[PDB]
Symmetry: C2
Subunit: 79 residues, 2 copies
């Protein structure tokens, strides 16, 4: 994070560090807003090549909420 | 309800009343377990003849639950 800190030591700037990671074989997106896209696009290539065998998702047990927490969120209403 | 009350005045029995409603133009199912099917099968023909124009469902406002009610159901947990 922090490429546009310079837009307000040279090798320890975020732009040049991201670019040196990108030139050395780290799957770097063009900015932060493509981070979900590049994670998704790596994971699709990992599923579609027999690398990751995903887990069949099962519902968990469920606790009741805390009163002192679910009072702040406004789900409980007592006078 | 109550066709098999006799299986433990004659025209005031549930079997004969259901059959007399069925002979007079009331859409009676064969028993209670086809009631949802016959309601659904009437409603489909009511949609497919331009009779009922259904409402576009919109989410409602939401109140918080009562504490004294949502304590009995076990959603709230305070010592």
């Amino acid at each position: 994070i922090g490429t546009c800190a310079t837009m307000f030591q040279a090798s320890e700037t975020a732009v040049a560090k991201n670019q040196a990671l990108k030139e050395a074989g780290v799957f770097v997106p063009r900015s932060f807003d493509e981070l979900g896209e590049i994670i998704q696009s790596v994971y699709e290539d990992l599923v579609a090549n027999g690398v990751i065998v995903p887990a069949q998702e099962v519902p968990p047990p469920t606790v009741p909420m805390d009163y002192s927490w679910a009072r702040e969120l406004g789900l409980i209403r007592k006078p």
